[PDB]
Curated annotation (Swiss-Prot), chain A:
Highest taxon of the lineage: Bacteria
Name by which UniProt lists this protein: Large ribosomal subunit protein uL14
Any one GO molecular-function label of the UniProt entry: large ribosomal subunit rRNA binding
Assembly: Part of the 50S ribosomal subunit. Contacts protein L19. Forms a bridge to the 30S subunit in the 70S ribosome, contacting the 16S rRNA.
InterPro entries attached to this UniProt entry: Ribosomal_uL14, Ribosomal_uL14_bac-type, Ribosomal_uL14_CS, Ribosomal_uL14_sf
Keywords, alphabetical: Ribonucleoprotein, Ribosomal protein, RNA-binding, rRNA-binding
Similarity-based family: Belongs to the universal ribosomal protein uL14 family.
GO biological process, one term: translation
Cellular component annotations (GO), alphabetically ordered: cytosolic large ribosomal subunit
Signal sequence, start to end: none
Role: This protein binds directly to 23S ribosomal RNA. Contacts the 16S rRNA of the 30S subunit in two different positions helping to form bridges B5 and B8.
Keyword Membrane in record: no
UniProt KW Ribonucleoprotein keyword: yes
From Swiss-Prot, chain C:
SUPFAM superfamilies: Prokaryotic ribosomal protein L17
This protein's name: Large ribosomal subunit protein bL17
Similarity comment: family membership: Belongs to the bacterial ribosomal protein bL17 family.
GO cellular component, one term: cytosolic large ribosomal subunit
Signal peptide start and end residues: none
Any single Pfam family the record assigns to this protein: Ribosomal_L17
PANTHER family membership: LARGE RIBOSOMAL SUBUNIT PROTEIN BL17M (PTHR14413:SF16), RIBOSOMAL PROTEIN L17 (PTHR14413)
Keywords: Ribonucleoprotein, Ribosomal protein
Highest taxon of source: Bacteria
Oligomeric and partner information: Part of the 50S ribosomal subunit. Contacts protein L32.
Curated annotation (Swiss-Prot), chain D:
Name under which the protein is recorded: Large ribosomal subunit protein bL19
HAMAP family, per the entry: Ribosomal_bL19
Name of a matching Pfam family: Ribosomal_L19
PANTHER family (UniProt xref): LARGE RIBOSOMAL SUBUNIT PROTEIN BL19M, RIBOSOMAL PROTEIN L19
GO biological process, one term: translation
Cellular component GO terms, alphabetical: cytosolic large ribosomal subunit
One annotated GO molecular function: structural constituent of ribosome
Sequence intervals crossing the membrane: none
Lineage: superkingdom: Bacteria
InterPro entries per the UniProt record, alphabetical: Ribosomal_bL19, Ribosomal_bL19_CS, Ribosomal_bL19_sf, Translation_prot_SH3-like_sf
SUPFAM superfamilies cross-referenced by the UniProt entry: Translation proteins SH3-like domain (SSF50104)
Protein keywords: Ribonucleoprotein, Ribosomal protein, RNA-binding, rRNA-binding
Family note: Belongs to the bacterial ribosomal protein bL19 family.
Lineage, uppermost ranks: Bacteria, Thermotogati, Deinococcota, Deinococci, Thermales
Curated annotation (Swiss-Prot), chain E:
Gene Ontology MF terms in the entry: structural constituent of ribosome
Keywords from the named record: Ribonucleoprotein, Ribosomal protein
Cellular component GO terms held in the UniProt record: large ribosomal subunit
Quaternary structure and partners: Part of the 50S ribosomal subunit.
Biological process terms in GO annotation: translation
UniProt record similarity statement: Belongs to the bacterial ribosomal protein bL32 family.
Protein name in UniProt: Large ribosomal subunit protein bL32
Organism from which the protein derives: Thermus thermophilus (strain ATCC 27634 / DSM 579 / HB8)
Region Disordered, residue ranges: 1-29
InterPro entries: Ribosomal_bL32 (IPR002677), Ribosomal_bL32_bact (IPR044957), Ribosomal_zn-bd (IPR011332)
Length: 122, 204, 118, 131, 59, 7
RNA sequence: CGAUGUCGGCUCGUCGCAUCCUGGGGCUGAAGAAGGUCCCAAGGGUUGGGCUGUUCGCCCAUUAAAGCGGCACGCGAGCUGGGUUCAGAACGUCGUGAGACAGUUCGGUCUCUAUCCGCCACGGGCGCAGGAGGCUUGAGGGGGGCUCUUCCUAGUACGAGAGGACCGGAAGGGACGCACCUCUGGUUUCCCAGCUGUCCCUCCAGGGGCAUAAGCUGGGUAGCCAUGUGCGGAAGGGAUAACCGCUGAAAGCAUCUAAGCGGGAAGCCCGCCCCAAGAUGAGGCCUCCCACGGCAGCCGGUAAGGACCCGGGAAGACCACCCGGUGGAUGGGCCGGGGGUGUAAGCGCCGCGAGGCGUUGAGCCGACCGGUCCCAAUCGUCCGAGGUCU
RNA sequence: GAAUGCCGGCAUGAGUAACGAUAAAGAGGGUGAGAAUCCCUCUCGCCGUAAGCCCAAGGGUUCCUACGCAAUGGUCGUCAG
């Protein structure tokens, strides 16, 4: 449940640290973004000399949420933060690493690169 | 147009192909036929179904005479299923198989006098910024001198629920003939213990 | 909505309502029979039937439990020594409520008696 | 009729009795059958059980873990057929029935608050001496 | 608000039509099987003190 | 770098 | 002018169509794709932000689209009160001055009680020619009506290439709607535990009040719920719009038309869901009572039935509705289970002690699922047909 | 017959709003024609830098006792300033 104004950690080495969702790229008027949904974001905090810098308007895919996501098998999974991975217009990651676990929902949603770079897929 | 009377018993989930499927459990049969509606005599076609046995001590004479002509023990409720003429003289859950698709009718839970926010999902008022005793009020209800009145059907506060509701196209997940049970995926109107009607769907 | 909720409110907040029940319990267990309004009477039944049943157990844990409501040690003694023994073979139902025929004058309220059973 | 018995009757085909009893505060490894791309796998999830909400067949339990610097909580139905096995890896003694407070604690604060439930540990070791 | 107020005096006919629902229903009363007095059903008889066939209360 | 920063 | 509250916002809509999108078309300087432009179409839809009192507008990020207008520039006995529009104050400017300025600036009392119409809900009465208990037909209303992406067809037709379809077929969404509580997530005013201060019971131990209308804190059943779950828009039939025809004169040719007949829209009718015989045009079917006594009328006693009263209820403001009333499981208790809390008190043992260990998943324990006549629905009363005329 | 006329009487709104701090009550026993409301007892709750006590102002018999309840008391009243 990410929506405009929501801050997210960036789980990659793109240089970003914190992004604030400014749009949920899901149809005409999606209220929320969950795992696997792409957002548009402003970069609110970056480390010096990165691929992205503070003030960039980037796209990112939500890779884990503090709201638990439910699964057709009757189980759920929840994380301790909202994290996302900065991507390009071809849904490819813009960094070389991703940090922390990601939700397996990314695989079925079409983000095979990120899932591979993930240390754990839960 | 097969149909059967039932009582809603409660909800659960079962597992089916490593997938959790929320179900609501309905006790349907057995349902004797007590009167058949014919085009020759009644102008249409239907079966009057009985359901749930009744203590004869509390069945009055005119009803007792009705059951008698049918050859049926006294029953609690009588409901008709329209355009349905079962070959037998008793309808059970076995008229439904798993994977079929049904419409379920029940009486929704009664909320009594419901405000405009619960009944009609109105937005109410602000909760600060000067809002003055209107937090749950409906707002304007009209215009001014033209038309100088309120439309019929204007959404307002009033009784909500305890009405007939049909939810449609529910998958029949399982049927347990030994206990007249019927598992249906999803949500069925009404409280546990209420009277439901299960009919073959009208969705193609 | 009030769907499947147990418990009268009796237009008292939570600590006043518990105190109402405790004071009525003391009065019933003291006099054997008391007059109240019908709604209060109907609520007393459960509250007192539990204290009596605990008195049937008789152990020290029961006494301290019952003391939490009744507070009066002599009263509990009468409950454990005199009242509870006469119910030893009775499975619940230690209290009865019978309605009275005349209402109060000043507020028309319907009255009932609540008594301990024989 | 007894509506409650009818529901328990519906649930009886799916009730499991092979899984070990455990309590909040116990550290646990759940072997869980997942599907990834084509095939299906067994992925272990090991952590402290922070709650067990009971509803007969519909009872569920939450297991919390720190994975690569991120807290992960996972909820499992206790009678889920996707559960291959559950290995008790440690018995912890809690004083609460729900342990959400360990979300705000460091690793050494948790270790100090949830210490080994020596009693039930002895019980496990006394069993398994079944012969 | 802006203080709503009757626009016209209610007519004799109209205020009496309002009151067509105000007649009291007489108290419902059964005879007491002991003393034969008229009393409300399901109450202890206030005349002889009996209910359910036995003496319950002093009159 | 929490948590929002000032700078 | 013995008062028609004046901008904007919010809330709630509803209508028009000169149509923003979606559906159907003709022309194109239409290869395809994507456009342009005109015609038909008002069913549905028509996003979230920054600035500003703003309407408007500009901008950011999206979108199928971010339509324009009416309804007293819709809506202050619905809310707001930022602007404007009293009294205070100041700036620029004008005036000798008092003062003044659709110039600016800071501040600045928006009235508990709805009689009538109207609207949302719910009853009472009478009627529907015997009196009743059931089950129904549906005249006529109302609700609903949205849409995108990806894949297959097929990198095919078209195209130098870039690019890239029609038709047909799958899958997955967004917003909205109805219902629901198994799951996820709330609440859960006393369901359990822990805690501080104080006063008290009874000194220890154990407890009770108060600290909020829960003292505080950690939890939390049923219920009510959404963030959660199911399901819905349809399909289909029919008649049409623009538009395209078949056959065809008048008018030897031609012409969709004058006779006749096709095709053709998210739109119209039906279909789906809900209300519904006060539909006074008051419908239909099944069943029950039965022709009573006394001078289309009266008074009585009754029949079938119903009401009263009572125990209650996921029904409910009252009313109504539904269930039950001893031939009974309706509520209360009690028992069993569930569920919550998380190992009571007492005792024993270890420690100088705070405590710890065992007894012990103990004790307590709302509503949920059941059982059990232990308590209470005692006993009764009053209404209620004899059926108009051709 | 009108002057938002004057004085008085009586209507309507209506058995409606309200009955004046949300500190809170319950039972038993008295009294009496009559009692939720007066007296007594027990239980409960509220104030306690007061919601307790003592002066001053102002008020002017409101103090105490007996006997009463038409009106006054926002209900009742056997009680009371
Ligand atoms: Mg990093
Ligand atoms: Mg840099
Ligand atoms: Mg910066
Ligand atoms: Mg990256
Ligand atoms: Mg990290
Ligand atoms: Mg990997
Ligand atoms: Mg199955
Ligand atoms: Mg029934
Ligand atoms: Mg129902
Ligand atoms: Mg029904
Ligand atoms: Mg209902
Ligand atoms: Mg209700
Ligand atoms: Mg409301
Ligand atoms: Mg709502
Ligand atoms: Mg609702
Ligand atoms: Mg609603
Ligand atoms: Mg709102
Ligand atoms: Mg709100
Ligand atoms: Mg508020
Ligand atoms: Mg105000
Ligand atoms: Mg105000
Ligand atoms: Mg107001
Ligand atoms: Mg307010
Ligand atoms: Mg007006
Ligand atoms: Mg106006
Ligand atoms: Mg008009
Ligand atoms: Mg209703
Ligand atoms: Mg409905
Ligand atoms: Mg489907
Ligand atoms: Mg069965
Ligand atoms: Mg019901
Ligand atoms: Mg509510
Ligand atoms: Mg409420
Ligand atoms: Mg109940
Ligand atoms: Mg109740
Ligand atoms: Mg209570
Ligand atoms: Mg109250
Ligand atoms: Mg009150
Ligand atoms: Mg009170
Ligand atoms: Mg009251
Ligand atoms: Mg309190
Ligand atoms: Mg006492
Ligand atoms: Mg006595
Ligand atoms: Mg009394
Ligand atoms: Mg009382
Ligand atoms: Mg109890
Ligand atoms: Mg009685
Ligand atoms: Mg009475
Ligand atoms: Mg009185
Ligand atoms: Mg009174
Ligand atoms: Mg159940
Ligand atoms: Mg793995
Ligand atoms: Mg850890
Ligand atoms: Mg500790
Ligand atoms: Mg410790
Ligand atoms: Mg231990
Ligand atoms: Mg107002
Ligand atoms: Mg006001
Ligand atoms: Mg007013
Ligand atoms: Mg007038
Ligand atoms: Mg009037
Ligand atoms: Mg008059
Ligand atoms: Mg008159
Ligand atoms: Mg008159
Ligand atoms: Mg009237
Ligand atoms: Mg009235
Ligand atoms: Mg009446
Ligand atoms: Mg004027
Ligand atoms: Mg005037
Ligand atoms: Mg005027
Ligand atoms: Mg006026
Ligand atoms: Mg047009
Ligand atoms: Mg279009
Ligand atoms: Mg088009
Ligand atoms: Mg040309
Ligand atoms: Mg084209
Ligand atoms: Mg075109
Ligand atoms: Mg339209
Ligand atoms: Mg429109
Ligand atoms: Mg703005
Ligand atoms: Mg800002
Ligand atoms: Mg402008
Ligand atoms: Mg487009
Ligand atoms: Mg906008
Ligand atoms: Mg406009
Ligand atoms: Mg105009
Ligand atoms: Mg408009
Ligand atoms: Mg104008
Ligand atoms: Mg203007
Ligand atoms: Mg206006
Ligand atoms: Mg206005
Ligand atoms: Mg106003
Ligand atoms: Mg305004
Ligand atoms: Mg107005
Ligand atoms: Mg108004
Ligand atoms: Mg309003
Ligand atoms: Mg202001
Ligand atoms: Mg202002
Ligand atoms: Mg301005
Ligand atoms: Mg101003
Ligand atoms: Mg100057
Ligand atoms: Mg000058
Ligand atoms: Mg000059
Ligand atoms: Mg000025
Ligand atoms: Mg001016
Ligand atoms: Mg001006
Ligand atoms: Mg200017
Ligand atoms: Mg200025
Ligand atoms: Mg100020
Ligand atoms: Mg009115
Ligand atoms: Mg009002
Ligand atoms: Mg009028
Ligand atoms: Mg009626
Ligand atoms: Mg009849
Ligand atoms: Mg009938
Ligand atoms: Mg019908
Ligand atoms: Mg119709
Ligand atoms: Mg009509
Ligand atoms: Mg229609
Ligand atoms: Mg449509
Ligand atoms: Mg291809
Ligand atoms: Mg190509
Ligand atoms: Mg081809
Ligand atoms: Mg080519
Ligand atoms: Mg297609
Ligand atoms: Mg809509
Ligand atoms: Mg709804
Ligand atoms: Mg529900
Ligand atoms: Mg609901
Ligand atoms: Mg729940
Ligand atoms: Mg539940
Ligand atoms: Mg929960
Ligand atoms: Mg839940
Ligand atoms: Mg709950
Ligand atoms: Mg308690
Ligand atoms: Mg303790
Ligand atoms: Mg201290
Ligand atoms: Mg204490
Ligand atoms: Mg003492
Ligand atoms: Mg002590
Ligand atoms: Mg105290
Ligand atoms: Mg205090
Ligand atoms: Mg207090
Ligand atoms: Mg506080
Ligand atoms: Mg406490
Ligand atoms: Mg709490
Ligand atoms: Mg909670
Ligand atoms: Mg939702
Ligand atoms: Mg859908
Ligand atoms: Mg041609
Ligand atoms: Mg031709
Ligand atoms: Mg020709
Ligand atoms: Mg023609
Ligand atoms: Mg045609
Ligand atoms: Mg053709
Ligand atoms: Mg056609
Ligand atoms: Mg469509
Ligand atoms: Mg109907
Ligand atoms: Mg009729
Ligand atoms: Mg009907
Ligand atoms: Mg008509
Ligand atoms: Mg007529
Ligand atoms: Mg007729
Ligand atoms: Mg009829
Ligand atoms: Mg017919
Ligand atoms: Mg009731
Ligand atoms: Mg009743
Ligand atoms: Mg009622
Ligand atoms: Mg009825
Ligand atoms: Mg009935
Ligand atoms: Mg009955
Ligand atoms: Mg009966
Ligand atoms: Mg009876
Ligand atoms: Mg009966
Ligand atoms: Mg029962
Ligand atoms: Mg029972
Ligand atoms: Mg009850
Ligand atoms: Mg249990
Ligand atoms: Mg348990
Ligand atoms: Mg211990
Ligand atoms: Mg112990
Ligand atoms: Mg020692
Ligand atoms: Mg337990
Ligand atoms: Mg207990
Ligand atoms: Mg139990
Ligand atoms: Mg349940
Ligand atoms: Mg029995
Ligand atoms: Mg009798
Ligand atoms: Mg005169
Ligand atoms: Mg004159
Ligand atoms: Mg005059
Ligand atoms: Mg005047
Ligand atoms: Mg006037
Ligand atoms: Mg004058
Ligand atoms: Mg005058
Ligand atoms: Mg005068
Ligand atoms: Mg006068
Ligand atoms: Mg005079
Ligand atoms: Mg006068
Ligand atoms: Mg007068
Ligand atoms: Mg008057
Ligand atoms: Mg009057
Ligand atoms: Mg009234
Ligand atoms: Mg009254
Ligand atoms: Mg009124
Ligand atoms: Mg008032
Ligand atoms: Mg009132
Ligand atoms: Mg007041
Ligand atoms: Mg008061
Ligand atoms: Mg008062
Ligand atoms: Mg106060
Ligand atoms: Mg207060
Ligand atoms: Mg206080
Ligand atoms: Mg008491
Ligand atoms: Mg009292
Ligand atoms: Mg008293
Ligand atoms: Mg007395
Ligand atoms: Mg009194
Ligand atoms: Mg008294
Ligand atoms: Mg008093
Ligand atoms: Mg006294
Ligand atoms: Mg002090
Ligand atoms: Mg103090
Ligand atoms: Mg004076
Ligand atoms: Mg007096
Ligand atoms: Mg008096
Ligand atoms: Mg008097
Ligand atoms: Mg005198
Ligand atoms: Mg007075
Ligand atoms: Mg008086
Ligand atoms: Mg007064
Ligand atoms: Mg006297
Ligand atoms: Mg005195
Ligand atoms: Zn008698």
């Amino acid at each position: 449940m990410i929506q405009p104004q929501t801050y997210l950690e960036v789980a990659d080495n793109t240089g970003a640290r914190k992004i604030m969702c400014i749009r949920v790229l899901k149809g005409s008027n999606a209220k929320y973004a969950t795992v696997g949904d792409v957002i548009v974001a402003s970069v609110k905090e970056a480390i010096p000399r990165g691929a992205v810098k503070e003030g960039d308007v980037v796209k990112a895919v939500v890779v884990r949420t503090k709201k638990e996501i439910k699964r057709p098998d009757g189980s759920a999974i929840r994380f301790d933060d909202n994290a996302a991975v900065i991507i390009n217009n071809q849904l490819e990651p813009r960094g070389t690493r991703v940090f922390g676990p990601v939700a397996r929902e990314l695989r079925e949603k079409g983000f095979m690169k990120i899932v591979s770079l993930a240390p754990e897929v839960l | 147009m097969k149909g059967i009377l039932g009582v809603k018993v409660g909800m659960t989930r079962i597992f089916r192909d490593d997938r959790a499927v929320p179900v609501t459990v309905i006790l349907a049969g057995p349902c004797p036929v007590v009167q058949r509606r014919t085009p020759e005599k009644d102008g249409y076609t239907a079966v009057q179904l009985g359901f749930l046995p009744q203590n004869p001590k509390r069945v009055n004479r005119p009803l007792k005479g009705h059951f008698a002509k049918a050859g049926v023990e006294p029953v609690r409720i009588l409901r008709e299923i329209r355009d349905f003429n079962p070959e037998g003289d008793t309808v059970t859950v076995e008229i439904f198989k798993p994977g079929e698709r049904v419409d379920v009718t029940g009486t929704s839970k009664g909320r009594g006098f419901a405000g405009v926010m619960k009944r009609w999902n109105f937005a109410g008022g602000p909760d600060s910024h000067g809002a003055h005793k209107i937090h749950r009020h409906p707002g304007s209800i009209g215009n001014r001198k033209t038309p100088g009145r309120v439309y019929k059907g204007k959404k307002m506060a009033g009784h909500y629920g305890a009405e007939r509701v049909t939810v449609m196209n529910l998958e029949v997940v399982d049927v347990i003939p030994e206990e007249n049970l019927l598992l249906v995926k999803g949500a069925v109107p009404g409280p546990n213990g209420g009277l439901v009607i299960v009919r073959e769907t009208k969705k193609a | 909505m009030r769907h499947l909720k147990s418990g009268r409110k009796l237009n008292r907040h939570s600590s006043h309502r518990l105190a109402l029940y405790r004071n009525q319990a003391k009065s019933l267990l003291t006099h054997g029979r008391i007059t109240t309004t019908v709604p209060k009477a109907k609520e007393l039944r459960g509250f007192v039937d539990h204290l009596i049943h605990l008195a049937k157990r008789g152990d020290l844990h029961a006494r301290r439990l019952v003391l939490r409501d009744l507070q009066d040690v002599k009263l509990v003694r009468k409950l454990f020594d005199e009242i509870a023994p006469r119910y030893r073979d009775r499975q619940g139902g230690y209290t009865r409520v019978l309605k009275l025929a005349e209402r109060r004058r000043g507020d028309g309220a319907p009255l009932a008696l609540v008594e301990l059973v024989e | 009729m007894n509506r409650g018995a009818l529901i328990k009757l519906v649930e009886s085909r799916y009730v499991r009795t092979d899984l070990p009893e455990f309590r909040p505060g116990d550290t646990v490894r759940v072997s869980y059958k997942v599907k990834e791309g084509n095939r299906t796998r067994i992925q272990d999830f090991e952590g402290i059980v922070i709650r067990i909400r009971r509803n007969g067949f519909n009872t569920t339990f939450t297991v919390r873990k720190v994975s690569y610097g991120v807290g992960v909580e996972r909820i499992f139905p206790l009678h889920s057929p996707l559960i291959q096995k559950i290995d008790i890896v440690q018995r912890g003694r809690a004083r609460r029935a729900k342990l959400y407070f360990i979300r705000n604690l460091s690793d050494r604060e948790i270790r100090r608050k949830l210490r080994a439930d020596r009693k039930r540990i002895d019980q496990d070791r006394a069993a398994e001496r079944a012969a | 608000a802006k203080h709503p107020v009757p626009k016209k005096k209610t007519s004799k006919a109209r205020r009496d039509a309002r009151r067509s629902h105000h007649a009291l229903t007489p108290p419902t009363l059964v005879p007491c099987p002991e003393c034969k007095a008229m009393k409300p059903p399901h109450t202890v008889c206030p005349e002889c003190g009996y209910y359910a066939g036995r003496k319950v209360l002093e009159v | 770098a929490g948590x929002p920063h000032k700078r």
